Design a protein around this ligand. Structure first.
Ligand SMILES: [Ca+2]
Ligand SMILES: [Ca+2]
Ligand SMILES: [Ca+2]
Ligand SMILES: [Ca+2]
Ligand SMILES: [Ca+2]
Ligand SMILES: [Ca+2]
Ligand SMILES: [Ca+2]
Ligand SMILES: [Ca+2]
Ligand SMILES: [Ca+2]
Ligand SMILES: [Ca+2]
Ligand SMILES: [Ca+2]
Ligand SMILES: [Ca+2]
Ligand SMILES: [Ca+2]
Ligand SMILES: [Ca+2]
Ligand SMILES: [Ca+2]
Ligand SMILES: [Cl-]
Ligand SMILES: [Cl-]
Ligand SMILES: [Cl-]
Ligand SMILES: [Cl-]
Ligand SMILES: [Cl-]
Ligand SMILES: [Cl-]
Ligand SMILES: [Cl-]
Ligand SMILES: [Cl-]
Ligand SMILES: [Cl-]
Ligand SMILES: [Cl-]
Ligand SMILES: [Cl-]
Ligand SMILES: [Cl-]
Ligand SMILES: [Cl-]
Ligand SMILES: [Cl-]
Ligand SMILES: [Cl-]
Ligand SMILES: [Cl-]
Ligand SMILES: [Cl-]
Ligand SMILES: [Cl-]
Ligand SMILES: [Cl-]
Ligand SMILES: [Cl-]
Ligand SMILES: [Cl-]
Ligand SMILES: [Cl-]
Ligand SMILES: [Cl-]
Lengths: 348, 348, 348, 348, 348
């Protein structure tokens, strides 16, 4: 078969790839819509007439094409959208869920965790999330050690002793702030400490890991296999969080997962974007191989953001929803979803 | 679909896996036939009733099952046979060549290299290989520096200045012998120096790489991703040579190829065994991504051994043959081959 | 003298080697019976007519023979059986206990430790072991941090404050689980933490050692001198646990013990298998040199599993038994034991 | 059995150990006679009544006894004499050559190399050695680069192009001298460069190895397993040369050989002393395992010094002699030799 | 001036060197008397007629003379005796205290620390030492963690909360024992932990330093500058304890002190032997440069052993005694002492 058209849509950029036999695949790119769309349009000059089944060859040709333009990250976010759409097309052509094409379904669902006067508001909100059935929540910090600790303390009190708690500083801290925060918050029972410092300073991450006891997580902006491998080599993280729509799509995240196993580093995919990104992430989560394999292994969990969730899921005919804290993974062909075109508006 | 039976055959052990819908896949295991067959028989207790499409899940479950038995290498060679058969089944089920399932066909053929009174015999034989059209040949050394040099010198003279020449010591040398050989043979124009020292001494490999200028190759017995990664980390090789039927099959060699790209280490698959192993290797070679991508990139080449070649290819209805030094890669469903069952004899 | 025959038996594979003068030696191989037997049968083609007294030469020739078959671990487990039988023959020929041939008897006995609604069952069982006289016990974990902690807590309560306690996760944990478990269990008084993570990830072991305070033990599946040395170099363990029937027999475990002394790493031999493996382990334990030598030094202790113990010891005429927690080490020629042939059934 | 007496003799100190059943063993210690004899006398206070068959236990007890006296090297040279005598006793008790007790005879003989107006004298002498049948010779340098080169050049001319040539500076050079010498002499065909710099500066050895291409050898004064391991870890040598009578006897040199295999470093035993030391070295050489095993492997060669050779061999009834460059290895019980007591004079 | 004679005496070997002008110097060697005396006698062959003022030239010539005898430690202990006597002669010739020749007197005295049913006996004895005025004491452990802890606890109770407490295991522990002991004893207030593990395993020392919080001390048997530098490079110790009579005398301990300053490692000289060794140590202590220089800096303290103290000091006319815990440092020419010859008996 052959690609006959590549289109870009908004409402976050979505990539639509149509084939001669009528098969349509959908993908999504991380980051600013316009830069991604321009690059996809550029990529499409070559994609037209190509065989969409050859995802590795397409990936490598397109990735290599944009090397001297300096914008590695943009190449990867743009390629991600194309790559996801292509796997969607493969799944539809072959009659298989992407999770099956990736090597099989370990799980039919994943547990979600909920993400959120800052002290009382977090405490209230997180208390409601627990009532809604979420086994875990993640709270945003990185503003100031003393205030952040007040928030963490109030959230632990509000959610009771059992619900899991993660914290995310979104690179808000200096190393010293992060180490001090981690030392003082550890007593509250924290499963991970996300992006404590700026993402370019991998040795600072390692410093935070060695200076306080909460497991450190990162990776949503560390590009593809090379960026991930640099962080793994520096000992930057206990948990790696690749973004499917940012790191190079299914083709590249498979390679990242391999690297993580060498280091015994857990993968927890970054989930954020429209229903398309979410659908792609869930296919990967279904297929993720436990490290180690055992009865009741450690399994991926899915970030769930009630903020703009209705909006972000409007692109889907059937929303991927958390039911008592659990999200079911589609098993139909490709991403197993149907696009609501009306919700979109075509760009260029 | 479901696996209904797993059978082992001889004539080198071959693995046959039959499914409920009648689909049959074929694979092959490196090493002693009987140990491999026993483990495959053991694996089959679980395989029966499983969905053959779920190759990653099957791989990881089976690999994990044999961990405390101490025999990691045997797990991998046995699993390899199963894994190859399963991909053959996937290809047949999906209507796709394995090379397409692996991500696309970069090439429809590969150049072969020919492998071989030891001085005159090598010189004559290699001179005939050149006349047969092979662009390259590999000669066996590791017996004694002075004698090996005489052989290398006579082969270069006999094949003219253009044909490429590789040498393989099959771990015959001490570090000092290997460094001395490499220093003195380099002037003859040698593309690589295969397995100069014992395969357990990765630092010795690195020593050979740093002490003489011919590129060092190895890997046919370094197990799966972990064994390969140890060699890559030690700086053991310029060229990695994974064996499909030994390292864990298509599932595991894909992961090995990823690792090699981090290090900018070339992959040249080990080719040796029956027509089944050869067919599997060729599917992988078709799909191998150049590192780097460029016009006329460096491409895999295929070891071709005229020794027992008719015998080893008797398992195929249509032999994979070198025509003026070039081997065409099948593009039919799965391995793209048909088994000559009459040539086999079932074991157990 | 000369080897006249090599036979394999079941009931776990046992190796019987007979000599021209009538001397018979017995050994045992770790892992699946059939693969081991096939390789022993293969080895026997050469062994027949060889001088059984030349154990190092035999070891190295046989080990080298199976290098390119990829199955290093299988070579070692098979060789182990042969090697143990050969030392048994040497001891009988020379009129000496293997422990004397290994360099002398430091000790005539060793203290055993006992190995075992999962919470109450462990607590009850371990409470009985203490009453039986065992100075120590080892409990199996690696299922889930919270549940495992409940088990550990109940076992410590049940056995009182004096009995030593070890834990074994059998590679059940991720690094993070293992570090968290170790941190929270340390307060219960734990002498070692066995195989916290998968055995291929040596750096993960080191991570567990640096992240929590219980001493880490491993080694039952790290092959021979090279595998052991990789783990020692990575800082993987505080305690190394080579399996005599798995690592290459007496010839190879002596070399492993040497390596451990360089690193000041304690050796505690893995004990598991039939009475033959147990007998071999005890000969090694008698001869193990303290590190350091002092009055009342740290001494090997022997794992004792009441599970299938009667069965596994049925191969012996006189069972090696724990009497108030202490096992006496035979001092007769060779392994100092007599085989109950009736309990066996010959294979091939 | 039991040791009844330990005696020290001169003519180089010799150690005689007599047992209750009349068995007598002989050993030798490296270095100044009197210090060695005093320590042996001290050791004998404990040795009397001990079982001579327990060589490892005896070794470790005696080695540990002298730790805080500061004189590690003296402990090892003294222990060496005792250890050699004990193995001689074991061999006699058991009816076995030491080479058999060490694990078997790989070889019944070894090739010797010959050791030697300094320019003409070396040239003449080495020319005679070649006529006598020696395959190789070693010349003494370390006096001055220009003069040493003149010597090397004249020796190569005199011995023809085939005879192997080694050089020994006996720590005479600075690093710079050694690198310059090695660079300029390499063209003469030199198999190794012995002790280029002072033995305490292991990093200087490594510097010499990296700065010039002749293989570096050392080790005659690097104590036992720990001293050897430090040199191996520093990358000090291509060839390790332990002295049996200096490094801790057969018990300790076995451990050193193990360490060398990890590093793929060749062992060539230092041979120097009376006929007793030579006899011990030859037993070890018979038993040395090739690294790697192959047809016609690299084998130990024996230093042969015609200087005081008649004198040093006067302690033997039958001299170990080079016949056309080859020395046959005794195969009788123990060291396989008989002592000429008349040649000795008892000390203390 | 010229050396006319060198004599060795007992009552521990003492070295007497007489000069043509009648000047006599005295020194002492660590370790077994007889080996030291033999080497001193050997050294004397050359010393006679040499200028005793040239201590560095003499040191280096004599040290170099014994290199290939393997006995580095013995060279240093023997040389130490000579070197101390030579500095004594220099001081007498020049009219200066050795402490002045070493570069000046920072202090006229040092505080001593006292060294010692094992629980009650230590507690009683240490309680008396406190009453005698010692600011500190050191207790001997390394027998068994539980018993050693009982001792430490009872000693802290008996001596009150202010007196300083050090512990010395004399290499009695495995790494694990030492780490466990240090963790559990730290709460008692321990200034240092001496020789926790065997002195050959420098990495084990480092392991003990990183695994528990009491400062680690060692060095009494690490030879001269090279042995000390290896320990410093390995991060073996917080406190280095060179023995003047063992490490190469004043000439070599000055060099060791220099090395320690690079690493910011404290020097506390080992004090043990006759009054001569004590006198030499005190001269060095007077001259030791603080690291850092400040008002009331950290100063050397002197081990004081009431065991055989009268005996060991019998060699002096005026004993160096602790008065309320403080020892005054002689300021007369040389070692500032007078020998009681009657207490000696000449050897050889
Ligand atoms: Ca709500
Ligand atoms: Ca985030
Ligand atoms: Ca901290
Ligand atoms: Ca032909
Ligand atoms: Ca090969
Ligand atoms: Ca070179
Ligand atoms: Ca019971
Ligand atoms: Ca275990
Ligand atoms: Ca921790
Ligand atoms: Ca002659
Ligand atoms: Ca030499
Ligand atoms: Ca150079
Ligand atoms: Ca008193
Ligand atoms: Ca001490
Ligand atoms: Ca600690
Ligand atoms: Cl659509
Ligand atoms: Cl970018
Ligand atoms: Cl599907
Ligand atoms: Cl990247
Ligand atoms: Cl969401
Ligand atoms: Cl078929
Ligand atoms: Cl296809
Ligand atoms: Cl692996
Ligand atoms: Cl072929
Ligand atoms: Cl029998
Ligand atoms: Cl294996
Ligand atoms: Cl015995
Ligand atoms: Cl190994
Ligand atoms: Cl048992
Ligand atoms: Cl005799
Ligand atoms: Cl024999
Ligand atoms: Cl040593
Ligand atoms: Cl000789
Ligand atoms: Cl005097
Ligand atoms: Cl010494
Ligand atoms: Cl003065
Ligand atoms: Cl030194
Ligand atoms: Cl004192």
């Amino acid at each position: 078969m052959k690609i006959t058209a590549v289109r870009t849509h908004l409402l976050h950029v979505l990539v639509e790839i149509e084939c001669d036999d009528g098969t349509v695949g959908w993908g999504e790119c991380l980051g600013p819509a316009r830069p991604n769309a321009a690059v996809v349009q550029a990529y499409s000059g070559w994609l037209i007439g190509q065989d969409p089944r050859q995802t590795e060859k397409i990936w490598a040709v397109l990735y290599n094409a944009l090397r001297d333009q300096g914008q590695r990250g943009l190449s990867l976010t743009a390629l991600s959208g194309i790559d996801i759409a292509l796997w969607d097309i493969k799944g539809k052509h072959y009659g298989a869920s992407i999770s099956m094409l990736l090597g099989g379904r370990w799980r039919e669902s994943v547990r979600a965790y909920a993400t959120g006067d800052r002290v009382s508001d977090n405490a209230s909100e997180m208390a409601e999330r627990r009532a809604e059935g979420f086994h875990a929540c993640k709270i945003k910090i990185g503003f100031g050690v003393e205030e952040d600790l007040r928030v963490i303390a109030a959230v632990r009190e509000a959610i009771g002793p059992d619900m899991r708690l993660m914290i995310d500083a979104n690179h808000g801290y200096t190393v010293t702030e992060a180490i001090t925060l981690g030392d003082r918050a550890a007593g509250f029972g924290i499963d991970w400490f996300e992006e404590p410092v700026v993402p370019e300073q991998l040795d600072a991450y390692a410093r935070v890991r060695a200076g306080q006891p909460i497991p450190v997580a990162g990776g949503e902006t560390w590009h593809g296999r090379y960026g991930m491998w640099q962080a793994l080599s520096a000992g930057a993280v206990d948990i790696l969080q690749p973004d499917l729509c940012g790191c190079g799509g299914f083709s590249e995240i498979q390679k990242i997962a391999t690297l993580a196993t060498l280091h015994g580093v857990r993968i927890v995919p970054h989930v954020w974007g429209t229903g398309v990104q979410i659908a792609a992430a869930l296919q990967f989560m279904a297929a993720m191989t436990p490290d180690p394999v055992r009865v009741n292994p450690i399994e991926p969990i899915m970030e769930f953001d009630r903020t703009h969730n209705p909006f972000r899921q409007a692109v889907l005919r059937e929303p991927l929803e958390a039911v008592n804290g659990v999200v079911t993974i589609p098993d139909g062909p490709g991403l197993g979803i149907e696009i609501n075109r009306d919700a979109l508006t075509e760009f260029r």
